[PDB]
Every structure is written in structure tokens, then in C-alpha cells.
Amino acid sequence: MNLFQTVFTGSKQALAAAEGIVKQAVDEKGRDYKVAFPDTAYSLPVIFAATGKKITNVGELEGALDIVRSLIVEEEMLDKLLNSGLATAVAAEIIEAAKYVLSDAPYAEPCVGFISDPIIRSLGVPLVTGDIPGVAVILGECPDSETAAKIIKDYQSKGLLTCLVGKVIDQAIEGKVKMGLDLRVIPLGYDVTSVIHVVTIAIRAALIFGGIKGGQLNDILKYTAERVPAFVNAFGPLSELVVSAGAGAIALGFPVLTDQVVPEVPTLLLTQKDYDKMVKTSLEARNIKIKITPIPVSFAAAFEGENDMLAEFGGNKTKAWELVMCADQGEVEDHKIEVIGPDIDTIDKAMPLGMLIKVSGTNMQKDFEPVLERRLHYFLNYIEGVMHVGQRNLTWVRIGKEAFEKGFRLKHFGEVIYAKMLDEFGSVVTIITDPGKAEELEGKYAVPRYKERDARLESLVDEKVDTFYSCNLCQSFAPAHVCIVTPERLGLCGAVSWLDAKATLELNPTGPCQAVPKEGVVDENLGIWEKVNETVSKISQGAVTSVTLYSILQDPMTSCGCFECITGIMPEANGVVMVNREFGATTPLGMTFGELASMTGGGVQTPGFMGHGRQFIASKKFMKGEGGLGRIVWMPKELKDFVAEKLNKTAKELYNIDNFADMICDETIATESEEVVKFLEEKGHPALKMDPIM
Amino acid sequence: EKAKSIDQATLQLLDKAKQDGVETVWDRKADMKVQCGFGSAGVCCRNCSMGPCRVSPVPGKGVERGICGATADVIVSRNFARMVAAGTAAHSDHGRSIALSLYHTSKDGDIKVKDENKLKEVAKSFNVETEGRDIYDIAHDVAKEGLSNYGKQLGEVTLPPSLPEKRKELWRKLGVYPRAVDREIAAVMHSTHIGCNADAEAMIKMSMRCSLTDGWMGSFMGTEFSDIMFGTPHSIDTEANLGVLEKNSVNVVLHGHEPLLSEMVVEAASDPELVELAKSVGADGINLCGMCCTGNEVSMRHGIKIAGNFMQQELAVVTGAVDGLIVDVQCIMPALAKLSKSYHTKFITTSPKAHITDSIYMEFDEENPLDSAKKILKEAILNFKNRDQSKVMIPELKCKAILGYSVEEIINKLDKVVNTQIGPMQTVKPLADVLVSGVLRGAAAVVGCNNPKVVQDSAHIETIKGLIKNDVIVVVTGCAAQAAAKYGLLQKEAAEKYAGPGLATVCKLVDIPPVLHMGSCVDISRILDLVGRVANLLGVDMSDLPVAGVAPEWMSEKAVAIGTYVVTSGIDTWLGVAPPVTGGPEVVDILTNKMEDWVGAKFFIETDPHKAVEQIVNRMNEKRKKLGI
Numbered sequence A: 001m002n003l004f005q006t007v008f009t010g011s012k013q014a015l016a017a018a019e020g021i022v023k024q025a026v027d028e029k030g031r032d033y034k035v036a037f038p039d040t041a042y043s044l045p046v047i048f049a050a051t052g053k054k055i056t057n058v059g060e061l062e063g064a065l066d067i068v069r070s071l072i073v074e075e076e077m078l079d080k081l082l083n084s085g086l087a088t089a090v091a092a093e094i095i096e097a098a099k100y101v102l103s104d105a106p107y108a109e110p111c112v113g114f115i116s117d118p119i120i121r122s123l124g125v126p127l128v129t130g131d132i133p134g135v136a137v138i139l140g141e142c143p144d145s146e147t148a149a150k151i152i153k154d155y156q157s158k159g160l161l162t163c164l165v166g167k168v169i170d171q172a173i174e175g176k177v178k179m180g181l182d183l184r185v186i187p188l189g190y191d192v193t194s195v196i197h198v199v200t201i202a203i204r205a206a207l208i209f210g211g212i213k214g215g216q217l218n219d220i221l222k223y224t225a226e227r228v229p230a231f232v233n234a235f236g237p238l239s240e241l242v243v244s245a246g247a248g249a250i251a252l253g254f255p256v257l258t259d260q261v262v263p264e265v266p267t268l269l270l271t272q273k274d275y276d277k278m279v280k281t282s283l284e285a286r287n288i289k290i291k292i293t294p295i296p297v298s299f300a301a302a303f304e305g306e307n308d309m310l311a312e313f314g315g316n317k318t319k320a321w322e323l324v325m326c327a328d329q330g331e332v333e334d335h336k337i338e339v340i341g342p343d344i345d346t347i348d349k350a351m352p353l354g355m356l357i358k359v360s361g362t363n364m365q366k367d368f369e370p371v372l373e374r375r376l377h378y379f380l381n382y383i384e385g386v387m388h389v390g391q392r393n394l395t396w397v398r399i400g401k402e403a404f405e406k407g408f409r410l411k412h413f414g415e416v417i418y419a420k421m422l423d424e425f426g427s428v429v430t431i432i433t434d435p436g437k438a439e440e441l442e443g444k445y446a447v448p449r450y451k452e453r454d455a456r457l458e459s460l461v462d463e464k465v466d467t468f469y470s471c472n473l474c475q476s477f478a479p480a481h482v483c484i485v486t487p488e489r490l491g492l493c494g495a496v497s498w499l500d501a502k503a504t505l506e507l508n509p510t511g512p513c514q515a516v517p518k519e520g521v522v523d524e525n526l527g528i529w530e531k532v533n534e535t536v537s538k539i540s541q542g543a544v545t546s547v548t549l550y551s552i553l554q555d556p557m558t559s560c561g562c563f564e565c566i567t568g569i570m571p572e573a574n575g576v577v578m579v580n581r582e583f584g585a586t587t588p589l590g591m592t593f594g595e596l597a598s599m600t601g602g603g604v605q606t607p608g609f610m611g612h613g614r615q616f617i618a619s620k621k622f623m624k625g626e627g628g629l630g631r632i633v634w635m636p637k638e639l640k641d642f643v644a645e646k647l648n649k650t651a652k653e654l655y656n657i658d659n660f661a662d663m664i665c666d667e668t669i670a671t672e673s674e675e676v677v678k679f680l681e682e683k684g685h686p687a688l689k690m691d692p693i694m
Numbered sequence B: 001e002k003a004k005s006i007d008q009a010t011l012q013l014l015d016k017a018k019q020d021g022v023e024t025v026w027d028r029k030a031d032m033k034v035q036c037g038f039g040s041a042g043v044c045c046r047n048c049s050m051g052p053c054r055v056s057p058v059p060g061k062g063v064e065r066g067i068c069g070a071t072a073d074v075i076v077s078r079n080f081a082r083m084v085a086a087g088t089a090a091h092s093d094h095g096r097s098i099a100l101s102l103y104h105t106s107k108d109g110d111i112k113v114k115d116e117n118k119l120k121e122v123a124k125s126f127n128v129e130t131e132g133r134d135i136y137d138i139a140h141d142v143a144k145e146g147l148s149n150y151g152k153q154l155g156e157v158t159l160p161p162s163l164p165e166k167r168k169e170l171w172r173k174l175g176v177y178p179r180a181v182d183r184e185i186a187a188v189m190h191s192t193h194i195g196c197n198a199d200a201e202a203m204i205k206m207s208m209r210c211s212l213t214d215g216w217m218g219s220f221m222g223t224e225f226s227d228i229m230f231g232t233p234h235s236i237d238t239e240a241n242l243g244v245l246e247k248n249s250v251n252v253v254l255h256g257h258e259p260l261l262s263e264m265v266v267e268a269a270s271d272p273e274l275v276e277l278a279k280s281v282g283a284d285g286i287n288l289c290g291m292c293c294t295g296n297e298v299s300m301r302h303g304i305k306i307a308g309n310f311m312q313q314e315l316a317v318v319t320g321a322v323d324g325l326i327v328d329v330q331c332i333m334p335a336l337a338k339l340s341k342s343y344h345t346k347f348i349t350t351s352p353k354a355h356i357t358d359s360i361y362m363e364f365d366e367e368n369p370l371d372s373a374k375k376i377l378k379e380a381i382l383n384f385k386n387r388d389q390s391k392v393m394i395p396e397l398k399c400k401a402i403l404g405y406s407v408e409e410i411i412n413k414l415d416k417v418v419n420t421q422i423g424p425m426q427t428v429k430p431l432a433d434v435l436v437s438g439v440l441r442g443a444a445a446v447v448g449c450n451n452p453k454v455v456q457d458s459a460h461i462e463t464i465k466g467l468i469k470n471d472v473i474v475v476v477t478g479c480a481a482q483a484a485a486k487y488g489l490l491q492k493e494a495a496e497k498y499a500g501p502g503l504a505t506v507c508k509l510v511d512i513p514p515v516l517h518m519g520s521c522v523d524i525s526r527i528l529d530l531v532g533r534v535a536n537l538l539g540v541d542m543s544d545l546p547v548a549g550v551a552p553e554w555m556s557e558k559a560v561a562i563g564t565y566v567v568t569s570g571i572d573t574w575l576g577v578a579p580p581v582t583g584g585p586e587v588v589d590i591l592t593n594k595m596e597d598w599v600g601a602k603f604f605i606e607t608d609p610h611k612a613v614e615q616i617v618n619r620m621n622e623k624r625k626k627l628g629i
């Protein structure tokens, strides 16, 4: 039979069962005997919701059978199927109401039967506040008590209210499940009709909290469908009556998920055979998002801030790299947690760390990946005893001894990444500690992905944007930091680019990267837009009001703490100095990188000093209001050599200097200010012949 | 007098046409008075100079055979087959031109490979390697293999995978498996020649074999190669109806069927020099509009506003705001040459395949396509200076519409109703699921042109509205799709207003209108692909699914070839205009009865759209019962 005929058949069976039980009540207690459920102000909730009338005597209960008959219309059209399902629900209520007539207390422990109004009040508030994320209506029989207990204990672990009907009650007991109202596991009954006792919880929630009145069936069915997070999990062989009952659950907007082969209806009737996945399947099917998301060590935003290290990877010691690539083939696309290289346990005293992530889910753009490379930094930081800094190819991670003592493994890295990728990028959705694989892969996929990535803003100029993007993700530590981002001024962390910030708004409309229209142009050299200042004032909460985009002295842009390079003013040399996080020696200003960092970040407007990435150095808008890169006087050899051809070309476009890098002083030449100014005079730096910086 | 159209913008300009004293397709239809009945019944033969001959459509009375001895059923069946051969030829040259363009692609060339993923998948179908090779080397090999299907004399032709093996073996058993495209056209033209085939059953089977070379080959190749070079369509917004024309802008209307010229006129409209030229003549900018299939191809990929469908083309000129009407091939009423003389409009013909006397001829150079399109568009821009703003009248009536529903996009949209822990991704399972469950009673395809015998857009709208009310998802193409775009059915808002309980529910979940626009008629191959994919996923033939095709107001010989391949492919087809078959009792029996026993589907002729909808729903329920769904 098709889904329609199956539902009609079961509804007729439900009516036949309700006619037989009602006859017993008329023949045994008479048509005037009082019919009522224990402690309820809505008589028969289902009938009261559909008709707005109350059933008080057996004669009236007999009349209610015509409601069941009226809802069954054997015509193959959705509405008819759903009404047939509501007929089964009304029939189940009549059967249960009759049970309470023929017996004062028809139910007994473990089964509860009817749920009184005070319980609805007690559970309704946590349901509204979200403390009870969902209502799992488990119905039928599982293959074994081990699978039943496994599922029930899992639903209860997420704070869900589990309701059991059928043989699954006996299985929960046999599998040692703690049952009770406080334990959020309520056994309603062994009969299929006892499912109606949870349906009345949803209907009464609409009448009590929703403030809807009886008879407003469409408004009640809308409240349950949009406000009651319930779903059905039907296990074992399903009869026509059970399928018909499932249509009633679907009529209230509740998805039915079964382990049996049935005519599936997207988002409403589904078939999942893997019991180890039925929980995740049901939570997704009813849009239930759990706050808690496989690693012994703690994971939380508290470990974002930050003893010796067991293993260090990247920085200026080993070649580590991270890469998120979207590709439908080329490799096994799955939660393959794979580690190819010498594990950390091999280390005996204080290695590379390649991280290639592959995701090919629907609605995934090739320019959406960068937003992923950035989030890795946050996921890896939350791991207790692990810290991640640096952006893509230049990445620095230091694993802690405590973690080794915790027995943490690189395996948990792949798990934390995949699990968080599915949680955050749900709508749009391999470690290598071996040198060889790290090498080839570094340039086989990452460098290409990067080069094509940088290529975007490689020639682009701010001369053609109409809106900038403001990020407030660093506001966790710096309460007044509002990072403006431009195709030329990049996010101080070095990762978020004016385009990745654009993709962040597409993915998360209410995320950190928000639009700021470029209006009210005041100065092009200093970078002063009336809207840009205004949007910063709102996020900073009145702390930062006036700001400049291309100036380090006049109202500068606030700094956070993820800057790889710092730029400090050196008035004695009429210029500025630069230092990278890798450098551990003093600078001409008599300060180390860590000392400089404490003078730039904290979300404070600091004139003279600023934090920036490794790309801004070559940018024309770098300190342009102060003379551009011409002011750079001192720089570590390591950074000089890396950004050498990129500075020599941009410098030629401005001061025609062809060997600016050669004119810059470094720790090799000298660090002392007096010796640095002598070297500058010998060569002939433009900064000496430029206007006074301050 | 019967109403000429249901669209208010069309009726407004028809009054203006009368006041201006100009002729329209409706005026010429009236002038034809009682059209001939031998030609109408299909019993007139002119296949040799011994004729003309005209036998009686009424058996028993009048002349029984032609001068050669050909009975009415022979005459009718030969006339019907020639319509299929001509229809197939029209689509054949269209796709052939696309395949030749694919063969001349270049990295730094005007025509490039925009969708690389699609080309890689298409290469698998033609058995072309796609590993560590230049994309243009793959494109040229795929183009060469595609071109083989037009004239290979030895070996077997390549058909798309969506086509079930059950359907292929059924064609083989019947003797209608497809040969090369042009070769089959020759076979029909040969057997229809005097003194050849004189058996209705054999002739109708030959036409079915020929029609298959249109749907599963030329039209399929034309669509596939177009998506490779110009991009695969995805959901996009556009506006429809003559209200899209702007009085203070340069109105350039693209009419025709070929997509390369239209694609280049779009790129040309962005040339800074041409953008500035539009300002030099005193215009707001360049307002690009489209009409008929060509307009559909550009609106599917670039959202270019749709000015109108087949019978609205003359009325677009009547507004007095069309500065340039650029045309290529297929359904470009020759009347436009004379009509344009009463207005400033420059009627430009660009194809050597379709020369029209008294029209400006600017050949579209396929060697320098962008430069050629820029030179044509420049003439349309300069013509703005010759507009008489006092005689302009654009009806203030346009409509919003969503289109771009290719099979890839339909699948991409269906993935949003699939659990990450159960159903597979990028498959048609969600659509088959609702069809088997019974939420969607079936899926109908409403396609077709417009005919003066039917009130313009009346049958299209009444049929589509009736099918969606009865929970039957509707897919549209060509003038039928444009008719729906103008009325307002191609909107998300149309599901609550006109769709049944099940379809309105599916629309809310998948986030789609109740009517899906899948492109031009060469894009009817997408319908075959989609239905074929469902058939393969359910392990059944196409004749086993509750699907149907409808041509409420057809007229082109292409429509006959379409209908024929749709029926031969296993899908029941309904016709809103009776074809010339009445005079051949055996031919009528074959098309509307015996065919069911040959391909599992048959033709249904129904002029009343309300009766047609009832017949479609009943026939779908019949097929659902046989399948147990």
C-alpha cells in the first residue's frame, strides 16, 4: 500500500478500536457516567483544541466518535492524510478517556498514563527557556536493550525530555535507565494510544503559554509546529495504526524518524538504520542545536588566553602549515581523522605540523574557505594546553606538557576541527608530522590556494570599494577594539582580508564582520570617513570616537594582540622601526617585541605605535600620512629578507628607491640608536631628508 | 469577436497598432478566413509534380487515393513525418553551431570554458580523458565527439547517461534507436519522397527515430555545450512583459534562438566605449531585453529582462521604443521588416541561415564575435537619436520572475531537504521521495509557442494553474515559460496563491516557486534528463513514472518534433492545437492509441485546457496505481 492508504487503514483501525472501547463504557457504566482525565482544566485537550467543546459524560464521549469519522476522508491529497492522522489522535484520546472510565486508576508504575496540568506548567517553562532542548517521543521496540539504553541515555545527556511508549519501556529498564520526571525520562504506556499523553503536553502548552483558545486548531497546530521541539523515533515493525499515529505527529509539525523502510517524505518522515546516528539525525531533523559539542582535555573559550612545552611546531623552528580546501574528489571525503608522521609520544625532550582539511558539502564556495582557516586558530586555542598563532603557511603551534600528561593526541585535533566545522559551517558543509608529506603538500595545494587568494587583492585598490567591513571578534580580550578592514589595510591578525570579511557576513549575517558604508569623506591621506568613525563609536561603546585609517599619530586605529609585526616611532632618526614576533632581541627603542606589544594592543588609541600583519608593510597606505614606508629605518634581518622584493618595488613606485631593503638597518649592522643614525647618514635614507615625523 | 489575448499590456498595444494603422499576426489570421480543410486534416500532398493531390479525410466519400495511388493515411503520415524532420533540422543546426563554437574556444579568446566541472562530467559521457590535461584540449575533443553524433555513418552514437537502459533496449526492439542527426533527417526526407514508404505504421516509427536525434542529442548537446561555455544556470531574478522597456534608455531587444550572439551583445553592452556612446546620444544607459528562446537563454544565465513571447514580438515594435531589434534564426516573423518601416526601429538580421528582405543585414562574424556584437549594438545605440518620443507608449506593466532552474540547480536546491546523516547529496532522491509518497501527485512539463487559433497565453495559464492546484509540480520552457513569467506564476508567492496542499508544502521546504522555468526548448532536454534521473534512481523506465508533457498553444514544426520525442521517450503528451492528422484514421489511431503499446506513452489532443488538466491527473493516477504509489 502507498503512504496514503496505509494511513487511512490505520485511522479506520483506530476508529474501530475507539468504537469497541466506548461500547464497553456504555454497556458497563451507562451514557451518563462522568468522563474526565486526572487534574486537568481542558477536559479532553485534543477534542478541546479541535472543537473547543468539553467532554463531560460517556454519552458526549460517544458523540466525539463522529469527530474521528469526519477527519477520515479517503482522498489522496496531503491535507486529507494529515486530517486522517488527527483522526487517529482523537481516536487515541477517546480510547484513553474510556480507560479512565472503566477503571479509576488504569495506569500503575512504571507507566504514568495521563500527565496532569501541574506537570505541564512545571515542564513548560524550561521548554520555553530552552533548558529542555527537545522532546524525544521514542515508540516501538529496539533490536536489543543495549541499543535502547544507548539512545535514551544519550537523549537524556543533552537535557531532552524522553517519553517512552511500547516495548521500549521494558528495554530501558533492562538496560538500566534511570526513569523519572526529574530524570527527564517518562514511560507513558505500553499501548500505542498512550502516545496521545505527550501530544496533550504539546497542545496544552499552546493553550497555557501560547494563550490560544479552544477551537483555534490551525493556531494550535502552528504553535506546536513552531514552538514545541518534539519528534518521534519509531523503532521495530510499524503497523498501519502506528503509521497513522505518525501522521498525527506530522500534523502537529513533529518529524517522524524510523529504522524501518517507509515512503520517506523530506523533513517529515525519515528512515535511519544506523542506531549510532539516530540521535544526531533526530536533533538535526527538528533543528535542535545542543550547546555542548571527543578529547579528554577541557575545551572552552576560557583557554583562549593561553610551564614548558612537550612539542613545538612552526614559527622559526620547523615548517608547519594549515590549509582548508573545498573539493568533491581527489581523496576520501569523510570524517577521516588521519595522522601521517612521527607521533608526539616519540618525543623524549622539549617537528612540523601539517593541517590539510577537506570539505565538499553543498553550498560551499571556493572563496568561502579563508573564513575557515581563521576559525581553526580559535578551535585550536580552546584546547587546554595548546596555543595557535600565525596565519596559513607561517603558522606557530606549541603543545603543552599537561596535554601530554592528559594523553591528548593529534587525533583529537582532527576531531575538534571536523566537529566544530559541522557545528558552525553546518549550512555550507589530515595531520602530517612527516617532513616529506609536509613539504610536497605545502606547495601542492596550500601555496597555490594562497597565491590565488592573495592574487585577488594583489592588484586591487581601495580606489573602487563602496563599503568597508568592521570586525569585533578580538573584543573578547580588547573590549574597545573595532578592527576596520580595507583591500589595503588588513585585519591586524593578518588573516581576515577585506574579502574574507565579506564572506563572513554572507555566512553569518549577524557575525563579527559587518558592513560599514564609505560615506562622508573628510581626508584621503589620513583616512577619515564620518560613517567609519560612527560605526566604531557604537561597537567600542563610546570609548573610541575619532579615528584615522592611514595614520599612527593622529587618532590611530586601536590594536588588539594578534599582530605579527609592530611599528614604533623613532623621532631621533625622523622615522619608525619594525619588529616581528619571531625576534627575541632588543630594538633601537630599547624594547623587545613583548614590551612593544604591551604598548600597542589592549584596544586603546596609542599614538606613535601600531600593530599590523606582514602584508601591510608593502602597502602604499602604510603610514602614508607620515611619508609611507620611506620612514622604515630599522627592521630585523629575517623580516627584511622575507619582504625584500615586495618593498623594493613599492618603494620605487614612490621614492624610486631601488634598494630600500639595503638602506634599512638591522641587528647585524647595529641596534643602538646612535649607531643606527650613523648608518642612515652614510647610506642616505629618505627619512632623514623627509619632513619632521612629529 | 473572440479576445485576442489575456495579457493587458498586449491588449493595450493591440489598440495602438490599430490607431497607428499597422498589421499584426491577429489581423493576418483573420484575413486567412476559413483556412483550407485538406491542409488542416493533412490530406493534401505536394511531394511530386504529378500533383497537387487532395484525398477525402472522410472515409468512403470523395477521392480515395492520390495520382501515385497513395491512400489518405500515407499522405497524412508523410506530411506528419516531414514536420518532425524539419523540427529536428532546426534544433540540429542550433546545437551544431554550439559544438563548432566549443571547438574554437581559447584561454585568451572570446569564447571560453566557463563551467569546467560540467565539461569534465560531459567528457565522461563521450569517453574523453580529463586527467592532467588542458581544459581547452578536453573541450576540443568533447566538441569533436559531439560533432560525430551529427554525421557518423559507421559506429554507434553517444547518448547521455540519464537515459535508462530499459528505454534504450525498448527503442532497439522497436527499431527506432537513433542514428546520426543529419542522417536521420535524410532518411525521413527520402522515405517521404514519391514512390517510397506507403505504410502509416512504418512512417510514424521513422519519424519517432528521427525525433530522438533531437531530444537526446542535438537539443541535449546544445544545452550541455552552452552551459559549458556560457555557464550552467542557477536561481536568478528577472522581470517579464513589455513593461520592461524603458522610455529614456536605449532599448535593444534580442529575438531569435542562437545563444552566442545574445551572449556577446550582453558582454558588448558593458564595453566602456558603448556605455559612453549611449550617454552621447542622450540616454540613461543600455536597456537589454530578450524575446522567445534567445531571451530565455540570456535571462537564465544573466537575468536579462524578458520583453515578451512569440505573438508579442510585433507589439514590442508598436511601443515605438525599440531602437534596435537584433535577430538570428527561428520564429522571427518576416512581418517585422514591413512593420519596422512604420517606426524608427532598426530591424537587424545577423544570420546567413535567416536573411529577411528589407531588413538591415549585419552578419555576425563567428571568428571575431565580441567585435562583431559591438559593431551591431553600436548601430542600435546610434538609432536612439531617431526616436520620436511623442509616439512612444510602453504599457506600465511588468512582472517579477525567478528562473535558472537547471537540473544541477534543482538538485542543489533539493539538498536543503536532505538530512546530513541519511539521504545522499547531489541526487534527485528528494523529488522521487515526494512523488512516491504521494505529496506531489506527479510532474508535468508545459512547453510550447503561441497560436492565433488559441487566445494568447490563455491555454498556457489555465493549464499550468490547474496542474499546480492538483498538487502536480510544473516545469516550463520557451514561450510557455515566458507566459507564466508575465502572469506571475514564476514567483515564490505563487505557491500559497495557486498551488495545492502538497505542492505548497514542498515549495515552502525547498524554497521554490510552484512553476520552475528550465530554459528554452533546446532546454527541454533538461526535462528529459530530470525525468530520466528519477527513473534510474527508482530502477524503472520513464513510461512507469506519473509524468506528462503539454503543448497548449504550439505552432512550430519544432513543437511536433518535441512532442514526438517526448512520447517516444515514454512521456504522455497533450496537444492544445490539433495537428494535421484528422484525415488519416490509421495515423490518428497510431498517435493516440497504438503508440502506448510501442513506447508506453501516447498523444492526447485536447483544445479545452480544463478538460486536459482532468485527463492528465487521471492518467497520472492510472500510472501511479500500476506502480503501487
Ligand code: SF4
Pocket (backbone or CB within 6 Å): A471, A472, A473, A474, A482, A483, A485, A490, A491, A492, A493, A494, A495, A496, A560, A562
Ligand atoms: S585582528 Fe581584526 S580582522 Fe583579525 S580577528 Fe581580530 S578584529 Fe578580526
Ligand code: SF4
Pocket (backbone or CB within 6 Å): B045, B046, B047, B048, B049, B050, B051, B052, B053, B065, B066, B067, B068, B069, B070, B194
Ligand atoms: S505523392 Fe502522390 S498524391 Fe502526392 S502529389 Fe505525388 S502523386 Fe500526387
Ligand SMILES: [Ca+2]
Pocket (backbone or CB within 6 Å): A039
Ligand atoms: Ca488541581
Ligand SMILES: [Ca+2]
Pocket (backbone or CB within 6 Å): A075
Ligand atoms: Ca473533497
Ligand SMILES: [Ca+2]
Pocket (backbone or CB within 6 Å): A145, A174
Ligand atoms: Ca540482556
Ligand SMILES: [Ca+2]
Pocket (backbone or CB within 6 Å): A141, A142, A143, A236, A237
Ligand atoms: Ca523487534
Ligand SMILES: [Ca+2]
Pocket (backbone or CB within 6 Å): B121, B122, B125, B160, B161, B224
Ligand atoms: Ca551530462
Ligand SMILES: [Cl-]
Pocket (backbone or CB within 6 Å): A122, A123, A126
Ligand atoms: Cl524542571
Ligand SMILES: [Cl-]
Pocket (backbone or CB within 6 Å): A253, A254, A255, A267, A285, A286, A287
Ligand atoms: Cl520540523
Ligand SMILES: [Cl-]
Pocket (backbone or CB within 6 Å): B004, B014, B015
Ligand atoms: Cl482588437
Ligand SMILES: [Cl-]
Pocket (backbone or CB within 6 Å): B021, B022, B023, B338, B339, B342
Ligand atoms: Cl504594417
Ligand SMILES: [Cl-]
Pocket (backbone or CB within 6 Å): B320, B321, B343, B344, B345, B387, B388, B389, B391, B392
Ligand atoms: Cl518611434
Ligand SMILES: [Cl-]
Pocket (backbone or CB within 6 Å): B426, B427, B428, B429, B533, B537
Ligand atoms: Cl540522481
Ligand SMILES: [Cl-]
Pocket (backbone or CB within 6 Å): none
Ligand atoms: Cl486569469
Ligand code: NI
Pocket (backbone or CB within 6 Å): A474, A492, A493, A559, A560, A561, A562, A563, A601, A611
Ligand atoms: Ni591582536
Ligand code: NI
Pocket (backbone or CB within 6 Å): A474, A492, A493, A560, A561, A562, A563
Ligand atoms: Ni586581533
